[PDB]
Amino acid sequence: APVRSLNCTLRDSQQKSLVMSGPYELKALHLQGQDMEQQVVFSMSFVQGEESNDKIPVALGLKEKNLYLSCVLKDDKPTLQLESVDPKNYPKKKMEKRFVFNKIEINNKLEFESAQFPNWYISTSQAENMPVFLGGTKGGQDITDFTMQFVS
């Protein structure tokens, strides 16, 4: 069958929203009212991969864009990028591993671990207007916890 997808927004546990802030750039900032309506709308696809009760493999595409969050080595480090794909082939159930996040539910929050890079997480900074990034630590200054909002 097709791949199943849900539209959603994410907010970090400090309640910062995500917005595309330039060519293939995602930043996190405090938003409310008119400024929130520009927040990134993910198409979260439920993809092939190792699965458990609280650990669900997903891809995070941008709604109606041929753009996916992906995890790749850059200058020899696991990094988060926005990667373009052939819009005739995506989304698909068997997404390449760089596009796969383990969505992990712990204490009413979500973490997104890279499937490709174990123990590397979608992260935000405490400061406003900084990039969303792949972070290799938790319980530091970096935020690795999120909430999801379902969108029509």
Ligand X SMILES: CCNC(=O)CN1C[C@@H](C)OC[C@@H]1C
> Is 40 an interacting residue with respect to ligand X (CB under 6 A)?
yes
Region of 139 on the Ramachandran plot (φ > 0 left; ψ -120 to 50 alpha; else beta) = left
Using the minimum distance from each CB to ligand X, give the nearer residue, 119 or 149: 149
Using the minimum distance from each CB to ligand X, give the nearer residue, 106 or 151: 151
- Specify the stretch interacting with ligand X by CB under 6 A; choose among 26-34, 60-68, 112-120, 121-129: 60-68
Q: Give CA–CA dist 127/119, Å, rounded.
A: 23
Q: Give CA–CA dist 136/60, Å, rounded.
A: 19
> Is 60 an interacting residue with respect to ligand X (CB under 6 A)?
no
| Least CB distance to ligand X at residue 76 (A) | 30
Among 14, 38, 119, 126, the residue binding ligand X under the rule CB under 6 A is: 38
Length of the chain: 152
> Is 62 an interacting residue with respect to ligand X (CB under 6 A)?
yes
Q: Are 144 and 110 in contact (CB under 8 A)?
A: no
Among 26, 31, 41, 80, the residue binding ligand X under the rule CB under 6 A is: 41
Count the neighbouring beta carbons within 10 Å of the beta carbon of residue 64. Answer: 10
3-state secondary structure of 138: coil
Residues in contact with ligand X by the rule CB under 6 A: 20, 38, 40-41, 62-63, 65
